[PDB]
């Protein structure tokens, strides 16, 4: 299909790749009589591993010749051809994960800025003031636009330069 790939469920080497692991695993657990937890621990992993195979085959990942599932970047490809969960969705997740801690770091420096000596306030955090920021940081996309358009996000031209 896409890019000369095939869905991993209808792949073949992928099916080798799944059923070659259990063999090497089970031939190993034949050395432990069931009265041993190692007989159970190995068993539980073989059943744990097969779950993910039926998951990867189902979810529709694309395995190339090797049988290993690949991904696809472009929105116009992921979206239209149906699998965007590889990056396109989690690339939104991350930004909200990263910007949240990103923007929660900016407010704290603002709130702790005006004082007698902000320095000791950076070493020793007052967690309540940091908590009020961790709370306030949520919905940073809407709070970033506003510091952006109100003009309070940038520090403008009093920055220092050299020559």
């Amino acid at each position: 299909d896409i890019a000369g790939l095939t869905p991993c469920s209808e792949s073949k080497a992928f099916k080798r790749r799944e059923n070659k692991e259990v063999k090497s695993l089970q031939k190993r657990m034949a050395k432990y009589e069931e009265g041993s937890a190692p007989a159970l621990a190995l068993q539980a992993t073989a059943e744990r591993t097969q779950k993910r195979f039926e998951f990867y085959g189902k979810s529709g990942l694309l395995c190339g010749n090797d049988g290993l599932p690949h991904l696809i970047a472009d929105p116009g490809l992921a979206f239209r051809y149906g699998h965007a969960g590889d990056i396109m969705i989690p690339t939104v997740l991350f930004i909200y994960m990263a910007g949240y801690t990103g923007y929660a770091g900016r407010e704290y420096l603002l709130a702790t800025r005006g004082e007698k000596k902000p320095t000791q306030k950076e070493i020793i955090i007052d967690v309540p003031l940091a908590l009020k920021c961790v709370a306030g940081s949520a919905g940073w996309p809407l709070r970033a636009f506003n510091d952006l358009r109100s003009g309070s996000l940038l520090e403008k031209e009093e920055n220092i330069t050299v020559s």
Binding site: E157, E158, N159, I160, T161, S163
Partner: protein, 61 residues
């Protein structure tokens, strides 16, 4: 000219406080080349918190 305690912005090209606010600790009534003395909360590379400037450079805000 400029008066003690009032905030300042510094346009001196070679400096660590260039375009950075500072508070005059003292201004001399004299003919000194560099009469005004400012003070900055920030620290220089040398660890210097204070410096003398010329009237042509210091500007009060």
């Amino acid at each position: 000219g400029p008066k003690r305690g009032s905030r300042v912005k510094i346009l001196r090209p070679e400096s660590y406080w260039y375009n950075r606010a500072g508070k005059v600790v003292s201004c001399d009534q004299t003919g000194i080349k560099y009469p005004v003395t400012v003070r900055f909360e920030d620290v220089n590379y040398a660890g210097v918190s204070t410096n003398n400037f010329g009237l042509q450079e210091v500007e009060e805000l």
